[PDB]
Amino acid sequence: MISNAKIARINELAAKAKAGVITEEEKAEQQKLRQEYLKGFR
């Protein structure tokens, strides 16, 4: 049900680090973020 600056931020950083170079450190962060949302989803 979430869709605030969180979703926007995730896509921003993800796409950035993605179209940039992406690093284990960064990738790890997005992990908990997306993993958390998925855990709560609806």
PDB file of all heavy atoms in Angstrom:
ATOM      1  N   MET A   1       0.861  -1.219   0.000  1.00  0.00           N
ATOM      2  CA  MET A   1       0.000   0.000   0.000  1.00  0.00           C
ATOM      3  C   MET A   1       0.880   1.247   0.000  1.00  0.00           C
ATOM      4  O   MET A   1       0.399   2.355  -0.245  1.00  0.00           O
ATOM      5  CB  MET A   1      -0.903  -0.004   1.242  1.00  0.00           C
ATOM      6  CG  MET A   1      -0.160  -0.624   2.431  1.00  0.00           C
ATOM      7  SD  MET A   1      -0.974  -0.131   3.971  1.00  0.00           S
ATOM      8  CE  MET A   1      -2.539  -1.003   3.704  1.00  0.00           C
ATOM      9  N   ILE A   2       2.169   1.060   0.276  1.00  0.00           N
ATOM     10  CA  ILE A   2       3.107   2.177   0.306  1.00  0.00           C
ATOM     11  C   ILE A   2       3.409   2.664  -1.109  1.00  0.00           C
ATOM     12  O   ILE A   2       3.384   1.885  -2.064  1.00  0.00           O
ATOM     13  CB  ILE A   2       4.409   1.751   0.993  1.00  0.00           C
ATOM     14  CG1 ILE A   2       4.111   1.259   2.417  1.00  0.00           C
ATOM     15  CG2 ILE A   2       5.369   2.942   1.059  1.00  0.00           C
ATOM     16  CD1 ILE A   2       3.394   2.353   3.216  1.00  0.00           C
ATOM     17  N   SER A   3       3.693   3.958  -1.231  1.00  0.00           N
ATOM     18  CA  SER A   3       3.999   4.552  -2.531  1.00  0.00           C
ATOM     19  C   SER A   3       4.519   5.979  -2.363  1.00  0.00           C
ATOM     20  O   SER A   3       4.490   6.772  -3.306  1.00  0.00           O
ATOM     21  CB  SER A   3       2.744   4.562  -3.409  1.00  0.00           C
ATOM     22  OG  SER A   3       1.767   5.419  -2.830  1.00  0.00           O
ATOM     23  N   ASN A   4       4.992   6.301  -1.161  1.00  0.00           N
ATOM     24  CA  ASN A   4       5.511   7.639  -0.887  1.00  0.00           C
ATOM     25  C   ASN A   4       6.922   7.803  -1.457  1.00  0.00           C
ATOM     26  O   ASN A   4       7.306   7.100  -2.394  1.00  0.00           O
ATOM     27  CB  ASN A   4       5.513   7.905   0.626  1.00  0.00           C
ATOM     28  CG  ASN A   4       6.325   6.839   1.358  1.00  0.00           C
ATOM     29  OD1 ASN A   4       5.780   5.815   1.767  1.00  0.00           O
ATOM     30  ND2 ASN A   4       7.601   7.022   1.555  1.00  0.00           N
ATOM     31  N   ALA A   5       7.682   8.743  -0.895  1.00  0.00           N
ATOM     32  CA  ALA A   5       9.045   9.006  -1.355  1.00  0.00           C
ATOM     33  C   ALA A   5       9.907   7.745  -1.301  1.00  0.00           C
ATOM     34  O   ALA A   5      11.015   7.721  -1.835  1.00  0.00           O
ATOM     35  CB  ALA A   5       9.681  10.097  -0.490  1.00  0.00           C
ATOM     36  N   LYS A   6       9.393   6.700  -0.656  1.00  0.00           N
ATOM     37  CA  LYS A   6      10.130   5.446  -0.545  1.00  0.00           C
ATOM     38  C   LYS A   6      10.243   4.780  -1.913  1.00  0.00           C
ATOM     39  O   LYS A   6      11.345   4.538  -2.405  1.00  0.00           O
ATOM     40  CB  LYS A   6       9.418   4.506   0.433  1.00  0.00           C
ATOM     41  CG  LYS A   6      10.144   3.156   0.473  1.00  0.00           C
ATOM     42  CD  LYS A   6       9.611   2.317   1.639  1.00  0.00           C
ATOM     43  CE  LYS A   6      10.179   2.842   2.960  1.00  0.00           C
ATOM     44  NZ  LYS A   6      10.368   1.705   3.906  1.00  0.00           N
ATOM     45  N   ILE A   7       9.094   4.492  -2.523  1.00  0.00           N
ATOM     46  CA  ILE A   7       9.070   3.860  -3.838  1.00  0.00           C
ATOM     47  C   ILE A   7       9.869   4.694  -4.836  1.00  0.00           C
ATOM     48  O   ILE A   7      10.681   4.164  -5.597  1.00  0.00           O
ATOM     49  CB  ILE A   7       7.617   3.708  -4.318  1.00  0.00           C
ATOM     50  CG1 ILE A   7       7.005   2.440  -3.703  1.00  0.00           C
ATOM     51  CG2 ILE A   7       7.573   3.599  -5.847  1.00  0.00           C
ATOM     52  CD1 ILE A   7       6.917   2.585  -2.180  1.00  0.00           C
ATOM     53  N   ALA A   8       9.632   6.003  -4.820  1.00  0.00           N
ATOM     54  CA  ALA A   8      10.329   6.914  -5.721  1.00  0.00           C
ATOM     55  C   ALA A   8      11.841   6.842  -5.510  1.00  0.00           C
ATOM     56  O   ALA A   8      12.606   6.739  -6.470  1.00  0.00           O
ATOM     57  CB  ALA A   8       9.849   8.348  -5.482  1.00  0.00           C
ATOM     58  N   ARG A   9      12.262   6.898  -4.249  1.00  0.00           N
ATOM     59  CA  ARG A   9      13.683   6.843  -3.916  1.00  0.00           C
ATOM     60  C   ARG A   9      14.306   5.537  -4.404  1.00  0.00           C
ATOM     61  O   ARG A   9      15.346   5.543  -5.063  1.00  0.00           O
ATOM     62  CB  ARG A   9      13.866   6.968  -2.398  1.00  0.00           C
ATOM     63  CG  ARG A   9      15.353   6.879  -2.036  1.00  0.00           C
ATOM     64  CD  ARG A   9      16.113   8.045  -2.672  1.00  0.00           C
ATOM     65  NE  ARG A   9      17.337   8.319  -1.924  1.00  0.00           N
ATOM     66  CZ  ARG A   9      17.991   9.468  -2.065  1.00  0.00           C
ATOM     67  NH1 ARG A   9      17.544  10.384  -2.882  1.00  0.00           N
ATOM     68  NH2 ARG A   9      19.085   9.679  -1.386  1.00  0.00           N
ATOM     69  N   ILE A  10      13.664   4.422  -4.067  1.00  0.00           N
ATOM     70  CA  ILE A  10      14.159   3.107  -4.463  1.00  0.00           C
ATOM     71  C   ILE A  10      14.424   3.050  -5.968  1.00  0.00           C
ATOM     72  O   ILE A  10      15.523   2.700  -6.396  1.00  0.00           O
ATOM     73  CB  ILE A  10      13.144   2.026  -4.071  1.00  0.00           C
ATOM     74  CG1 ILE A  10      13.120   1.881  -2.544  1.00  0.00           C
ATOM     75  CG2 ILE A  10      13.542   0.687  -4.700  1.00  0.00           C
ATOM     76  CD1 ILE A  10      11.870   1.108  -2.119  1.00  0.00           C
ATOM     77  N   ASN A  11      13.410   3.390  -6.763  1.00  0.00           N
ATOM     78  CA  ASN A  11      13.549   3.363  -8.216  1.00  0.00           C
ATOM     79  C   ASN A  11      14.663   4.304  -8.669  1.00  0.00           C
ATOM     80  O   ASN A  11      15.432   3.979  -9.574  1.00  0.00           O
ATOM     81  CB  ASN A  11      12.214   3.742  -8.880  1.00  0.00           C
ATOM     82  CG  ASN A  11      12.215   5.196  -9.356  1.00  0.00           C
ATOM     83  OD1 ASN A  11      12.983   5.565 -10.245  1.00  0.00           O
ATOM     84  ND2 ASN A  11      11.382   6.043  -8.821  1.00  0.00           N
ATOM     85  N   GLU A  12      14.741   5.471  -8.035  1.00  0.00           N
ATOM     86  CA  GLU A  12      15.763   6.451  -8.383  1.00  0.00           C
ATOM     87  C   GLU A  12      17.159   5.876  -8.167  1.00  0.00           C
ATOM     88  O   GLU A  12      17.953   5.786  -9.103  1.00  0.00           O
ATOM     89  CB  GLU A  12      15.592   7.716  -7.534  1.00  0.00           C
ATOM     90  CG  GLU A  12      14.561   8.644  -8.186  1.00  0.00           C
ATOM     91  CD  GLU A  12      15.051   9.100  -9.559  1.00  0.00           C
ATOM     92  OE1 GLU A  12      16.047   9.803  -9.610  1.00  0.00           O
ATOM     93  OE2 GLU A  12      14.424   8.737 -10.541  1.00  0.00           O
ATOM     94  N   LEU A  13      17.453   5.491  -6.927  1.00  0.00           N
ATOM     95  CA  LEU A  13      18.760   4.932  -6.593  1.00  0.00           C
ATOM     96  C   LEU A  13      19.045   3.678  -7.419  1.00  0.00           C
ATOM     97  O   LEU A  13      20.131   3.528  -7.978  1.00  0.00           O
ATOM     98  CB  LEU A  13      18.811   4.584  -5.101  1.00  0.00           C
ATOM     99  CG  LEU A  13      20.210   4.875  -4.545  1.00  0.00           C
ATOM    100  CD1 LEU A  13      20.181   4.782  -3.018  1.00  0.00           C
ATOM    101  CD2 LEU A  13      21.209   3.849  -5.094  1.00  0.00           C
ATOM    102  N   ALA A  14      18.063   2.783  -7.483  1.00  0.00           N
ATOM    103  CA  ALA A  14      18.217   1.541  -8.236  1.00  0.00           C
ATOM    104  C   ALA A  14      18.611   1.821  -9.682  1.00  0.00           C
ATOM    105  O   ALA A  14      19.631   1.328 -10.161  1.00  0.00           O
ATOM    106  CB  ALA A  14      16.907   0.750  -8.209  1.00  0.00           C
ATOM    107  N   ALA A  15      17.792   2.609 -10.373  1.00  0.00           N
ATOM    108  CA  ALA A  15      18.054   2.943 -11.771  1.00  0.00           C
ATOM    109  C   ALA A  15      19.386   3.676 -11.925  1.00  0.00           C
ATOM    110  O   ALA A  15      20.119   3.450 -12.888  1.00  0.00           O
ATOM    111  CB  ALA A  15      16.925   3.821 -12.314  1.00  0.00           C
ATOM    112  N   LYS A  16      19.694   4.550 -10.971  1.00  0.00           N
ATOM    113  CA  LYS A  16      20.942   5.307 -11.007  1.00  0.00           C
ATOM    114  C   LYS A  16      22.129   4.361 -10.914  1.00  0.00           C
ATOM    115  O   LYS A  16      22.930   4.257 -11.843  1.00  0.00           O
ATOM    116  CB  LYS A  16      20.987   6.318  -9.857  1.00  0.00           C
ATOM    117  CG  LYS A  16      20.675   7.721 -10.392  1.00  0.00           C
ATOM    118  CD  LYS A  16      19.189   7.821 -10.767  1.00  0.00           C
ATOM    119  CE  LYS A  16      19.004   8.864 -11.873  1.00  0.00           C
ATOM    120  NZ  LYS A  16      19.428  10.203 -11.374  1.00  0.00           N
ATOM    121  N   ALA A  17      22.227   3.666  -9.783  1.00  0.00           N
ATOM    122  CA  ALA A  17      23.310   2.718  -9.567  1.00  0.00           C
ATOM    123  C   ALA A  17      23.309   1.658 -10.663  1.00  0.00           C
ATOM    124  O   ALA A  17      24.344   1.070 -10.969  1.00  0.00           O
ATOM    125  CB  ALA A  17      23.147   2.044  -8.203  1.00  0.00           C
ATOM    126  N   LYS A  18      22.137   1.423 -11.252  1.00  0.00           N
ATOM    127  CA  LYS A  18      22.020   0.428 -12.317  1.00  0.00           C
ATOM    128  C   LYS A  18      22.635   0.955 -13.611  1.00  0.00           C
ATOM    129  O   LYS A  18      23.547   0.343 -14.167  1.00  0.00           O
ATOM    130  CB  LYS A  18      20.548   0.071 -12.554  1.00  0.00           C
ATOM    131  CG  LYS A  18      20.421  -0.785 -13.820  1.00  0.00           C
ATOM    132  CD  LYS A  18      19.126  -1.600 -13.764  1.00  0.00           C
ATOM    133  CE  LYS A  18      18.991  -2.436 -15.039  1.00  0.00           C
ATOM    134  NZ  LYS A  18      18.726  -1.536 -16.196  1.00  0.00           N
ATOM    135  N   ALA A  19      22.128   2.093 -14.082  1.00  0.00           N
ATOM    136  CA  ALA A  19      22.631   2.696 -15.312  1.00  0.00           C
ATOM    137  C   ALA A  19      24.005   3.326 -15.088  1.00  0.00           C
ATOM    138  O   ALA A  19      24.605   3.868 -16.018  1.00  0.00           O
ATOM    139  CB  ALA A  19      21.652   3.767 -15.805  1.00  0.00           C
ATOM    140  N   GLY A  20      24.499   3.248 -13.852  1.00  0.00           N
ATOM    141  CA  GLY A  20      25.802   3.813 -13.521  1.00  0.00           C
ATOM    142  C   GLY A  20      26.874   2.728 -13.476  1.00  0.00           C
ATOM    143  O   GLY A  20      27.665   2.592 -14.409  1.00  0.00           O
ATOM    144  N   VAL A  21      26.886   1.954 -12.391  1.00  0.00           N
ATOM    145  CA  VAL A  21      27.861   0.875 -12.230  1.00  0.00           C
ATOM    146  C   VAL A  21      27.332  -0.181 -11.264  1.00  0.00           C
ATOM    147  O   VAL A  21      27.535  -1.379 -11.467  1.00  0.00           O
ATOM    148  CB  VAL A  21      29.195   1.424 -11.698  1.00  0.00           C
ATOM    149  CG1 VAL A  21      29.914   2.218 -12.795  1.00  0.00           C
ATOM    150  CG2 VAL A  21      28.938   2.337 -10.495  1.00  0.00           C
ATOM    151  N   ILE A  22      26.658   0.281 -10.211  1.00  0.00           N
ATOM    152  CA  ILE A  22      26.097  -0.608  -9.193  1.00  0.00           C
ATOM    153  C   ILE A  22      27.216  -1.245  -8.370  1.00  0.00           C
ATOM    154  O   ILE A  22      28.197  -1.749  -8.919  1.00  0.00           O
ATOM    155  CB  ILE A  22      25.204  -1.687  -9.847  1.00  0.00           C
ATOM    156  CG1 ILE A  22      23.790  -1.618  -9.243  1.00  0.00           C
ATOM    157  CG2 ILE A  22      25.786  -3.092  -9.625  1.00  0.00           C
ATOM    158  CD1 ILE A  22      23.857  -1.726  -7.715  1.00  0.00           C
ATOM    159  N   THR A  23      27.061  -1.209  -7.049  1.00  0.00           N
ATOM    160  CA  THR A  23      28.061  -1.776  -6.149  1.00  0.00           C
ATOM    161  C   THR A  23      27.396  -2.662  -5.101  1.00  0.00           C
ATOM    162  O   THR A  23      26.244  -2.440  -4.729  1.00  0.00           O
ATOM    163  CB  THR A  23      28.838  -0.653  -5.450  1.00  0.00           C
ATOM    164  OG1 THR A  23      27.980   0.026  -4.543  1.00  0.00           O
ATOM    165  CG2 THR A  23      29.366   0.336  -6.492  1.00  0.00           C
ATOM    166  N   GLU A  24      28.135  -3.663  -4.628  1.00  0.00           N
ATOM    167  CA  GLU A  24      27.617  -4.579  -3.615  1.00  0.00           C
ATOM    168  C   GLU A  24      27.003  -3.801  -2.454  1.00  0.00           C
ATOM    169  O   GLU A  24      25.934  -4.154  -1.955  1.00  0.00           O
ATOM    170  CB  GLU A  24      28.753  -5.467  -3.095  1.00  0.00           C
ATOM    171  CG  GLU A  24      28.189  -6.537  -2.152  1.00  0.00           C
ATOM    172  CD  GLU A  24      29.309  -7.133  -1.301  1.00  0.00           C
ATOM    173  OE1 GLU A  24      30.387  -7.346  -1.835  1.00  0.00           O
ATOM    174  OE2 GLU A  24      29.073  -7.370  -0.127  1.00  0.00           O
ATOM    175  N   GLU A  25      27.688  -2.739  -2.035  1.00  0.00           N
ATOM    176  CA  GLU A  25      27.209  -1.908  -0.934  1.00  0.00           C
ATOM    177  C   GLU A  25      25.838  -1.323  -1.261  1.00  0.00           C
ATOM    178  O   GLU A  25      24.891  -1.467  -0.487  1.00  0.00           O
ATOM    179  CB  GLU A  25      28.201  -0.771  -0.660  1.00  0.00           C
ATOM    180  CG  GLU A  25      29.632  -1.323  -0.621  1.00  0.00           C
ATOM    181  CD  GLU A  25      29.700  -2.562   0.270  1.00  0.00           C
ATOM    182  OE1 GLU A  25      29.660  -2.402   1.479  1.00  0.00           O
ATOM    183  OE2 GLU A  25      29.788  -3.655  -0.269  1.00  0.00           O
ATOM    184  N   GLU A  26      25.740  -0.667  -2.415  1.00  0.00           N
ATOM    185  CA  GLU A  26      24.480  -0.065  -2.840  1.00  0.00           C
ATOM    186  C   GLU A  26      23.416  -1.141  -3.023  1.00  0.00           C
ATOM    187  O   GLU A  26      22.323  -1.045  -2.466  1.00  0.00           O
ATOM    188  CB  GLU A  26      24.674   0.686  -4.161  1.00  0.00           C
ATOM    189  CG  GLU A  26      25.497   1.954  -3.924  1.00  0.00           C
ATOM    190  CD  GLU A  26      25.758   2.657  -5.254  1.00  0.00           C
ATOM    191  OE1 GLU A  26      24.900   3.412  -5.682  1.00  0.00           O
ATOM    192  OE2 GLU A  26      26.810   2.426  -5.828  1.00  0.00           O
ATOM    193  N   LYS A  27      23.751  -2.165  -3.805  1.00  0.00           N
ATOM    194  CA  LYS A  27      22.826  -3.265  -4.065  1.00  0.00           C
ATOM    195  C   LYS A  27      22.293  -3.849  -2.756  1.00  0.00           C
ATOM    196  O   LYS A  27      21.115  -4.198  -2.659  1.00  0.00           O
ATOM    197  CB  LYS A  27      23.538  -4.356  -4.870  1.00  0.00           C
ATOM    198  CG  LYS A  27      22.515  -5.366  -5.399  1.00  0.00           C
ATOM    199  CD  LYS A  27      23.247  -6.490  -6.140  1.00  0.00           C
ATOM    200  CE  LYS A  27      22.232  -7.399  -6.836  1.00  0.00           C
ATOM    201  NZ  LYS A  27      21.431  -8.131  -5.814  1.00  0.00           N
ATOM    202  N   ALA A  28      23.165  -3.952  -1.753  1.00  0.00           N
ATOM    203  CA  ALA A  28      22.767  -4.496  -0.455  1.00  0.00           C
ATOM    204  C   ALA A  28      21.677  -3.635   0.179  1.00  0.00           C
ATOM    205  O   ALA A  28      20.703  -4.154   0.725  1.00  0.00           O
ATOM    206  CB  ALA A  28      23.978  -4.563   0.479  1.00  0.00           C
ATOM    207  N   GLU A  29      21.847  -2.318   0.100  1.00  0.00           N
ATOM    208  CA  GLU A  29      20.868  -1.394   0.667  1.00  0.00           C
ATOM    209  C   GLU A  29      19.493  -1.622   0.043  1.00  0.00           C
ATOM    210  O   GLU A  29      18.530  -1.932   0.743  1.00  0.00           O
ATOM    211  CB  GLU A  29      21.313   0.053   0.431  1.00  0.00           C
ATOM    212  CG  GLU A  29      22.070   0.567   1.661  1.00  0.00           C
ATOM    213  CD  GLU A  29      23.451  -0.081   1.740  1.00  0.00           C
ATOM    214  OE1 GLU A  29      23.530  -1.211   2.195  1.00  0.00           O
ATOM    215  OE2 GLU A  29      24.410   0.562   1.344  1.00  0.00           O
ATOM    216  N   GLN A  30      19.411  -1.468  -1.278  1.00  0.00           N
ATOM    217  CA  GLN A  30      18.148  -1.662  -1.991  1.00  0.00           C
ATOM    218  C   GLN A  30      17.511  -2.998  -1.614  1.00  0.00           C
ATOM    219  O   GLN A  30      16.288  -3.143  -1.642  1.00  0.00           O
ATOM    220  CB  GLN A  30      18.375  -1.620  -3.510  1.00  0.00           C
ATOM    221  CG  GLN A  30      19.564  -0.713  -3.838  1.00  0.00           C
ATOM    222  CD  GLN A  30      19.573  -0.367  -5.324  1.00  0.00           C
ATOM    223  OE1 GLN A  30      18.697  -0.802  -6.073  1.00  0.00           O
ATOM    224  NE2 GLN A  30      20.522   0.392  -5.800  1.00  0.00           N
ATOM    225  N   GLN A  31      18.351  -3.973  -1.269  1.00  0.00           N
ATOM    226  CA  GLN A  31      17.867  -5.298  -0.894  1.00  0.00           C
ATOM    227  C   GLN A  31      16.891  -5.218   0.275  1.00  0.00           C
ATOM    228  O   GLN A  31      15.736  -5.624   0.153  1.00  0.00           O
ATOM    229  CB  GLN A  31      19.048  -6.198  -0.515  1.00  0.00           C
ATOM    230  CG  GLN A  31      18.673  -7.665  -0.743  1.00  0.00           C
ATOM    231  CD  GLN A  31      19.659  -8.579  -0.020  1.00  0.00           C
ATOM    232  OE1 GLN A  31      20.797  -8.186   0.242  1.00  0.00           O
ATOM    233  NE2 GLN A  31      19.289  -9.783   0.318  1.00  0.00           N
ATOM    234  N   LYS A  32      17.359  -4.702   1.410  1.00  0.00           N
ATOM    235  CA  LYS A  32      16.513  -4.589   2.595  1.00  0.00           C
ATOM    236  C   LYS A  32      15.282  -3.730   2.307  1.00  0.00           C
ATOM    237  O   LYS A  32      14.181  -4.043   2.756  1.00  0.00           O
ATOM    238  CB  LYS A  32      17.316  -3.996   3.764  1.00  0.00           C
ATOM    239  CG  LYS A  32      17.256  -2.463   3.731  1.00  0.00           C
ATOM    240  CD  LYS A  32      18.221  -1.886   4.772  1.00  0.00           C
ATOM    241  CE  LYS A  32      18.123  -0.357   4.769  1.00  0.00           C
ATOM    242  NZ  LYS A  32      19.056   0.200   3.749  1.00  0.00           N
ATOM    243  N   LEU A  33      15.479  -2.649   1.556  1.00  0.00           N
ATOM    244  CA  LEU A  33      14.379  -1.752   1.216  1.00  0.00           C
ATOM    245  C   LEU A  33      13.264  -2.508   0.495  1.00  0.00           C
ATOM    246  O   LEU A  33      12.119  -2.525   0.950  1.00  0.00           O
ATOM    247  CB  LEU A  33      14.887  -0.611   0.327  1.00  0.00           C
ATOM    248  CG  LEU A  33      15.677   0.392   1.174  1.00  0.00           C
ATOM    249  CD1 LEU A  33      16.389   1.387   0.254  1.00  0.00           C
ATOM    250  CD2 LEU A  33      14.722   1.151   2.102  1.00  0.00           C
ATOM    251  N   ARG A  34      13.607  -3.126  -0.634  1.00  0.00           N
ATOM    252  CA  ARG A  34      12.628  -3.877  -1.418  1.00  0.00           C
ATOM    253  C   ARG A  34      12.141  -5.104  -0.653  1.00  0.00           C
ATOM    254  O   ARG A  34      10.950  -5.416  -0.663  1.00  0.00           O
ATOM    255  CB  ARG A  34      13.248  -4.312  -2.750  1.00  0.00           C
ATOM    256  CG  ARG A  34      13.268  -3.125  -3.719  1.00  0.00           C
ATOM    257  CD  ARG A  34      11.845  -2.824  -4.201  1.00  0.00           C
ATOM    258  NE  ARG A  34      11.879  -2.159  -5.501  1.00  0.00           N
ATOM    259  CZ  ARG A  34      12.070  -2.842  -6.627  1.00  0.00           C
ATOM    260  NH1 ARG A  34      12.239  -4.137  -6.591  1.00  0.00           N
ATOM    261  NH2 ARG A  34      12.088  -2.218  -7.774  1.00  0.00           N
ATOM    262  N   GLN A  35      13.065  -5.795   0.008  1.00  0.00           N
ATOM    263  CA  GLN A  35      12.714  -6.987   0.774  1.00  0.00           C
ATOM    264  C   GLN A  35      11.723  -6.638   1.881  1.00  0.00           C
ATOM    265  O   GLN A  35      10.790  -7.396   2.151  1.00  0.00           O
ATOM    266  CB  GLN A  35      13.978  -7.605   1.382  1.00  0.00           C
ATOM    267  CG  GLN A  35      13.602  -8.763   2.316  1.00  0.00           C
ATOM    268  CD  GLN A  35      12.788  -9.813   1.564  1.00  0.00           C
ATOM    269  OE1 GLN A  35      13.100 -10.142   0.417  1.00  0.00           O
ATOM    270  NE2 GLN A  35      11.758 -10.366   2.144  1.00  0.00           N
ATOM    271  N   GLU A  36      11.930  -5.485   2.512  1.00  0.00           N
ATOM    272  CA  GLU A  36      11.046  -5.043   3.585  1.00  0.00           C
ATOM    273  C   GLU A  36       9.645  -4.782   3.041  1.00  0.00           C
ATOM    274  O   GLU A  36       8.664  -5.331   3.545  1.00  0.00           O
ATOM    275  CB  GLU A  36      11.600  -3.767   4.225  1.00  0.00           C
ATOM    276  CG  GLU A  36      10.604  -3.231   5.263  1.00  0.00           C
ATOM    277  CD  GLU A  36      11.226  -2.075   6.045  1.00  0.00           C
ATOM    278  OE1 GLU A  36      11.927  -1.280   5.437  1.00  0.00           O
ATOM    279  OE2 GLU A  36      10.989  -1.999   7.239  1.00  0.00           O
ATOM    280  N   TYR A  37       9.560  -3.942   2.010  1.00  0.00           N
ATOM    281  CA  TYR A  37       8.273  -3.617   1.405  1.00  0.00           C
ATOM    282  C   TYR A  37       7.532  -4.890   1.006  1.00  0.00           C
ATOM    283  O   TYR A  37       6.343  -5.030   1.273  1.00  0.00           O
ATOM    284  CB  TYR A  37       8.473  -2.731   0.171  1.00  0.00           C
ATOM    285  CG  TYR A  37       7.152  -2.566  -0.549  1.00  0.00           C
ATOM    286  CD1 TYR A  37       6.108  -1.853   0.056  1.00  0.00           C
ATOM    287  CD2 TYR A  37       6.967  -3.135  -1.816  1.00  0.00           C
ATOM    288  CE1 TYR A  37       4.883  -1.708  -0.607  1.00  0.00           C
ATOM    289  CE2 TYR A  37       5.742  -2.991  -2.477  1.00  0.00           C
ATOM    290  CZ  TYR A  37       4.700  -2.278  -1.872  1.00  0.00           C
ATOM    291  OH  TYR A  37       3.491  -2.138  -2.522  1.00  0.00           O
ATOM    292  N   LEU A  38       8.247  -5.810   0.365  1.00  0.00           N
ATOM    293  CA  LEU A  38       7.650  -7.071  -0.067  1.00  0.00           C
ATOM    294  C   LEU A  38       7.085  -7.838   1.128  1.00  0.00           C
ATOM    295  O   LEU A  38       6.039  -8.478   1.029  1.00  0.00           O
ATOM    296  CB  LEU A  38       8.706  -7.933  -0.774  1.00  0.00           C
ATOM    297  CG  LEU A  38       8.518  -7.870  -2.296  1.00  0.00           C
ATOM    298  CD1 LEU A  38       7.189  -8.528  -2.684  1.00  0.00           C
ATOM    299  CD2 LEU A  38       8.522  -6.408  -2.758  1.00  0.00           C
ATOM    300  N   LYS A  39       7.795  -7.773   2.252  1.00  0.00           N
ATOM    301  CA  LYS A  39       7.374  -8.471   3.465  1.00  0.00           C
ATOM    302  C   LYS A  39       6.065  -7.900   4.015  1.00  0.00           C
ATOM    303  O   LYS A  39       5.277  -8.623   4.625  1.00  0.00           O
ATOM    304  CB  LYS A  39       8.470  -8.357   4.529  1.00  0.00           C
ATOM    305  CG  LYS A  39       8.316  -9.486   5.553  1.00  0.00           C
ATOM    306  CD  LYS A  39       9.426  -9.381   6.604  1.00  0.00           C
ATOM    307  CE  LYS A  39       9.006  -8.399   7.702  1.00  0.00           C
ATOM    308  NZ  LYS A  39      10.217  -7.900   8.414  1.00  0.00           N
ATOM    309  N   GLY A  40       5.844  -6.604   3.807  1.00  0.00           N
ATOM    310  CA  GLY A  40       4.628  -5.958   4.302  1.00  0.00           C
ATOM    311  C   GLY A  40       3.591  -5.793   3.193  1.00  0.00           C
ATOM    312  O   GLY A  40       2.390  -5.787   3.463  1.00  0.00           O
ATOM    313  N   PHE A  41       4.074  -5.661   1.956  1.00  0.00           N
ATOM    314  CA  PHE A  41       3.212  -5.490   0.779  1.00  0.00           C
ATOM    315  C   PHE A  41       1.809  -4.999   1.168  1.00  0.00           C
ATOM    316  O   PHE A  41       1.639  -3.836   1.536  1.00  0.00           O
ATOM    317  CB  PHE A  41       3.130  -6.815   0.007  1.00  0.00           C
ATOM    318  CG  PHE A  41       2.433  -6.596  -1.316  1.00  0.00           C
ATOM    319  CD1 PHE A  41       2.994  -5.735  -2.269  1.00  0.00           C
ATOM    320  CD2 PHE A  41       1.229  -7.258  -1.594  1.00  0.00           C
ATOM    321  CE1 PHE A  41       2.350  -5.535  -3.496  1.00  0.00           C
ATOM    322  CE2 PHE A  41       0.588  -7.058  -2.822  1.00  0.00           C
ATOM    323  CZ  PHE A  41       1.148  -6.196  -3.772  1.00  0.00           C
ATOM    324  N   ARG A  42       0.813  -5.884   1.088  1.00  0.00           N
ATOM    325  CA  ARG A  42      -0.558  -5.519   1.439  1.00  0.00           C
ATOM    326  C   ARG A  42      -0.806  -5.744   2.930  1.00  0.00           C
ATOM    327  O   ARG A  42      -1.503  -4.962   3.578  1.00  0.00           O
ATOM    328  CB  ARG A  42      -1.551  -6.353   0.618  1.00  0.00           C
ATOM    329  CG  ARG A  42      -1.495  -7.821   1.059  1.00  0.00           C
ATOM    330  CD  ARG A  42      -2.220  -8.694   0.033  1.00  0.00           C
ATOM    331  NE  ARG A  42      -2.262 -10.078   0.490  1.00  0.00           N
ATOM    332  CZ  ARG A  42      -2.808 -11.037  -0.253  1.00  0.00           C
ATOM    333  NH1 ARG A  42      -3.319 -10.754  -1.421  1.00  0.00           N
ATOM    334  NH2 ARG A  42      -2.831 -12.264   0.188  1.00  0.00           N
TER     335      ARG A  42
END
